[PDB]
Design a protein around this ligand. Structure first.
Ligand SMILES: Cc1ccncc1NC(=O)[C@H](C)c1cccc(Cl)c1
Ligand SMILES: Cc1ccncc1NC(=O)[C@H](C)c1cccc(Cl)c1
Lengths: 304, 304
């Protein structure tokens, strides 16, 4: 029992972190096989970031200008290429610690663990959600660029995120491992607005099931609702509309607890309309949306 | 910017997790150098747990009855001893992945990362606090026994906790790495009460400083208080009394923000007396107490 914002064990990812220096800029890189991946803005000075022409900036750089250091040893760079917003540095040595891995582009509302790094060194791990507006509310300081988000399925690490930028609002933006930004963001020191964010409804419902499983049941009521009625409430409270696909993924939790998805929707409806009245659910005084139905099933069953 | 419940990178600890089986019971062990540490209740059957005589139960066991498996390979047990509530299995091979380490007994209110494990396999990492009543509000299922809590200072892992038991209330109890329980708990299937828990005042204050650093300042007021006046409020709201030692550890945060500790106490006093009025601080609708002043300084500066 107990329910925690749990992150994946970060070991397999720690073995991949390297420090990349180009000119006077240092950030983190991901060394997988014989390739080091990092944000392309490693090649810019602070003055370049205002309006960078990355093609022109990269043309002034050679293999020998990219300094890659893994722990305490130096990697020899034999090729460099830009793919979207990421640089790929071909090295002459394959990382002996390369885990089984994939590069995946996650959907908004999905969760992942972040290994926050500085100078190629891991400092912390936390679990977070890709917001519906494609931002992440991380914890990143200058030098954290190149830190990655990932999920793990038994022995396979699926890298889904690379940190690039902190927006003027303090929220974070980044790319998939092919360098494509999540959201409408560009890697430039220009004010950029993130869309209106919404609460991930299916995740809140999954979290309400985790609460019932762990004994927090005060919010269960004698009511039920319809998808249409629930969506009227969701719209008013800036919750993502619930679809039959979301109901389907909640099936295993509905099966375990015996509480039909639409009965849980009616509990959620009442909490949205009445608040928590000073009570807590799983030690939280607000509706938590950073646990997917898959995360609740995994945590509540002990998937290693 | 951003503030997360961040755990230490778990890599160095993952390399130490093993599976220990004795009879029909399997749990997790910690392999450091040529010794495997695990909860002594690995030797009990479900029937033994009601009122176990561990000395008598261990006398029926030999080195060959303890099966230790690290990943996929078997460790040869050449010695066994009980130290308080932990068994120490001497193995013929030193763990090649043994990090620099220490065994430390943490104080209540201190924080640590937990690597939750099942069958010697890591499944998740989360950060938590040792409650003032010596319990931890973890996330543990059957088979999680032997999972450990730790802190990391550059390259040194300080192990502070080993999970043993889930109390009838759903909270967790365990030992230091010498097998001494934190709190008044015994390793027996008998109802055991944890003391009245209190909120870790110094941690809430540290977290209010993290909020000011990250831009959440609405709770700052035009008031100040005295240690005596603040402690009257703390007593009424079941907060630990603040001492000059706590004020002293908050000095670096007071120095950074320019908000005197007693001015922050007056903000905390007003939040205790008025609640949050439907507002949030660092994405939380309640006063967070799982970040020490050291954790806030480390996270807010980027200590790797
Ligand atoms: C300062 C900081 C804090 C947290 N995350 C990232 C950062 N770093 C940045 O945002 C850096 C300086 C940057 C500027 C403009 C565009 C891009 Cl792609 C990257
Ligand atoms: C079931 C479970 C869930 C979460 N944590 C630990 C556990 N496991 C236990 O509490 C085990 C069965 C146990 C019983 C009585 C005393 C002791 Cl020392 C250990």
């Amino acid at each position: 029992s107990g329910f925690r914002k749990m992150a994946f064990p970060s070991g397999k990812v720690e073995g991949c972190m390297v420090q990349v220096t180009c000119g006077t800029t240092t950030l983190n890189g991901l060394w997988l096989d014989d390739v080091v991946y990092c944000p392309r803005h490693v090649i810019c000075t602070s003055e370049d970031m205002l309006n960078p022409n990355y093609e022109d900036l990269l043309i002034r750089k050679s293999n020998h200008n990219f300094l890659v250091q893994a722990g305490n040893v130096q990697l020899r760079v034999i090729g460099h290429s830009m793919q979207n917003c990421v640089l790929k540095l071909k090295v002459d040595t394959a990382n002996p610690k390369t885990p089984k891995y994939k590069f995946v582009r996650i959907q908004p509302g999905q969760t992942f663990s972040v290994l926050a790094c500085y100078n190629g060194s891991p400092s912390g791990v936390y679990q977070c959600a890709m917001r519906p507006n494609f931002t992440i509310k991380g914890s990143f300081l200058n030098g954290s660029c190149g830190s990655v988000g990932f999920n793990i399925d038994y022995d396979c690490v699926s890298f889904c995120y690379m940190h690039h930028m902190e927006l003027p609002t303090g929220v974070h933006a980044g790319t998939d491992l092919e360098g494509n930004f999540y959201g409408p963001f560009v890697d430039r020191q220009t004010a950029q607005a993130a869309g209106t964010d919404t609460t991930i409804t299916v995740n809140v419902l999954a979290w309400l099931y985790a609460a019932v499983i762990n004994g927090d049941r005060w919010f269960l009521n004698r009511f039920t609702t319809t998808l249409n009625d629930f969506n009227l409430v969701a719209m008013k409270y800036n919750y993502e509309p619930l679809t039959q696909d979301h109901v389907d993924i909640l099936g295993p939790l509905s099966a375990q607890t015996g509480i039909a998805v639409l009965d849980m929707c009616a509990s959620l409806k009442e909490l949205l309309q009445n608040g928590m009245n000073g009570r807590t659910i799983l030690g939280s005084a607000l509706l938590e949306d950073e646990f997917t139905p898959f995360d609740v099933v995994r945590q509540c069953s002990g998937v290693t």
